Structures are given as structure tokens and as C-alpha cells.
Symmetry: C2
Subunit: 131 residues, 2 copies
């Protein structure tokens, strides 16, 4: 996870609302969540990887081991099962709940960290740079 460790600030967001719609986030909530500009703080301690997200909407944190399924309460209050892997040099997260699934891919592109969240063929792209 060496390529991912650091504090990342949001530089661009594309198609976030439509992704949230696909996920089932409420109309009012999508407004508030759309206004947030979360940072992403990624760190490692031993075999535990932590991804923190800090914003006006919600402060979240997941702590996990690569390849080991874990319980997560999402920023929009879904209770999901997540599994995160190192796959083609990306961190790939699959979240499953209520027979549904979404894939969140975190990948380096030049000096940026690109986050692509996919649900039913709808993709939100968020671009981050080091703080």
C-alpha cells in the first residue's frame, strides 16, 4: 500500500450524484453529501490498513486487512460487507448489501490518486492530490 499512504485532498468529482442515486442515497442526503469535499487519509500499521475520510457530511474510517471480509457502515448508513484487495496495483474494494454490490477502485495515475466508484454501470470518478 506504499503508493497509497498519505493525506489526499479532492481536486475533481464527476458523476457523483448519479452514482449516489444508483446506490439508493436519498434526494435530500445527496445534496448535503454532494457539497462535501472529503479528504482521504490512508495509513498502515502492521497488516492493518486504514482509510479515513473527513468532511462536512461525515467523518468515516475503515480499518481492514487485505483480502479479509469485514463489516462496514457506510457514510450513507448502509450496513455492508467489504473486501479489499491489491489487484493490478490498485486497491479494489467490493461492497455487498441486500443482494447488491458496488466496486470502489483506488489507483495511482501520475501524481494523483483516482477513485472510481461503480454501480450497475454508473461510475463516479474522484481525483485526489497529495495535501
Amino acid at each position: 500500500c506504499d503508493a497509497f499512504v498519505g493525506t489526499w485532498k479532492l481536486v475533481s468529482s464527476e458523476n457523483f450524484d448519479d452514482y449516489m442515486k444508483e446506490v439508493g442515497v436519498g434526494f435530500a442526503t445527496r445534496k448535503v453529501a454532494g457539497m462535501a469535499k472529503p479528504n482521504m487519509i490512508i495509513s498502515v500499521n502492521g497488516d492493518l490498513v486504514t482509510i479515513r475520510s473527513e468532511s462536512t457530511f461525515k467523518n468515516t474510517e475503515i480499518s481492514f486487512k487485505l483480502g479479509v471480509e469485514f463489516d462496514e457502515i457506510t457514510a450513507d448508513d448502509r450496513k455492508v460487507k467489504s473486501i479489499i484487495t491489491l489487484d493490478g496495483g490498485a486497491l479494489v474494494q467490493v461492497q455487498k448489501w441486500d443482494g447488491k454490490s458496488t466496486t470502489i477502485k483506488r489507483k495511482r495515475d501520475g501524481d494523483k490518486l483516482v477513485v472510481e466508484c461503480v454501480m450497475k454501470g454508473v461510475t463516479s470518478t474522484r481525483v485526489y492530490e497529495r495535501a
Copy 2:
């Protein structure tokens, strides 16, 4: 857990610095941690309990099931194993790392939430009220 769900704000802190010393928290961290006045936000989603701490020092979160050991990275960056129980109507947390242990007790006392953290017979006491 119903008696614990809510947003709690710090109202008193007693012996916090000495507790941190006993834990082995370094001077500079103890200073910044002592200056912070963290909220504590406790929520439940199915069988998952989440305890979030928000302050200038750190934003942290643990999500866990009662009676099931889990991995935790503490605010002072210790990698510990935690187990949390409902015991005499209190939430009792035991954190273990490097052959050491500390116990964190969260209990209701009237309209307050009293948090007692014990390390080798040094006790820090922090009291919170609903926000």
C-alpha cells in the same frame, strides 16, 4: 446499547495526563491530546456498534460487535486487540498490546456518561453530557 446511543460532549476530565503517561504516550502527543475536547458519538446499526471520537487531536472510530475481539489502531497509534462487553449495564472495553492491558469503562450516571480508563491502577475519569 440504547442508553449509550447519542452525541456526547466532554464536561470534565480528571487525571487524564497521568493515565496517558502510564500507557506510554509521548510528551508531545499528551499535550495535543490534553488540549482536545473530543465529542463521543455512539451509534448502532443491526449488531454493529460504532464509537466515534471527533476533536482537533484526532478523529477516530471503532465499529465492533459485542463480545468479539477486533483490531484497533488507537489515537496515540498503538496497534491493539480490543474486546467490548455489556457488563453490569456498562460497556467495558479491554485493550491488549505488547503484553500490556488497559480497561475502558463507559457507564451511565444520571444524565451523564462517565468514562473510566485504567492502566496499572492509574485511572483517568472523563464525563460527558448529551450535546
